Write a protein that binds this ligand. Structure first.
Ligand SMILES: Nc1nc2c(ncn2[C@@H]2O[C@H](COP(=O)(O)OP(=O)(O)O)[C@@H](O)[C@H]2O)c(=O)[nH]1
Ligand SMILES: [Mg+2]
Length: 170
């Protein structure tokens, strides 16, 4: 039997939340995924010898949350907080995503990974050292990813699983 891990992917629209999830699930890069589609996905994967069933919500927009999105924020075990390395505003807005998670959990100790996506693109406006400074302040890992090439994608999700295990018995 399989251990469930409930993961939530958050961040500004346009950063690659959906592309990252689709790369993890389907091993393909999608270049035009509807920016409004929000849904949950499953993936069976062995991580460090444990058969895991990941339960992943790919969040979209900031319209009135569905009961499902509210449920995933409340009961989610770990969060991928995504910005794009060519989107300075998305990096600046990570603060707000962190603050939301801390409020929902009433805690500063929540399993989380800072993800800098679109690492394949040449227009880098967020330096790795800026992201490292932010992640160090929050006490969380920082991983750069490309949903296009798959670089870092498994790393980001597996690291989030490992961060959940560091926080609680699973
Ligand atoms: N080059 C490149 N484009 C990406 C990457 N991730 C997402 N995109 C593109 O960025 C746009 C937004 O991606 P999407 O996954 O819909 O973003 P979301 O709003 O965060 O779900 C789309 O045109 C994607 O093809 C990436 O790693 N590299
Ligand atoms: Mg999306």
């Amino acid at each position: 039997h399989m251990t469930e891990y409930k993961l939530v992917v958050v961040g500004a629209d346009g950063v690659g939340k959906s592309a990252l999830t689709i790369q993890l699930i389907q091993n393909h890069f999608v270049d035009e995924y509807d920016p409004t589609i929000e849904d949950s996905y499953r993936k069976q994967v062995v991580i460090d010898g444990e058969t895991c069933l990941l339960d992943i919500l790919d969040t979209a927009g900031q319209e009135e949350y569905s009961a499902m999105r509210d449920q995933y924020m409340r009961t989610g075990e770990g969060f991928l907080c995504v910005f794009a390395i060519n989107n300075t505003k998305s990096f600046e807005d990570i603060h707000h995503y962190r603050e939301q998670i801390k409020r929902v959990k009433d805690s500063e100790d929540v399993p989380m990974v800072l993800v800098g996506n679109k690492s394949d693109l040449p227009s880098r406006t967020v330096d790795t050292k800026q992201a490292q400074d932010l992640a160090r302040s929050y006490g969380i890992p920082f991983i750069e990813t490309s949903a296009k090439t798959r670089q870092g994608v498994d790393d980001a999700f597996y690291t989030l699983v490992r961060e959940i295990r560091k926080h609680k018995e699973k």
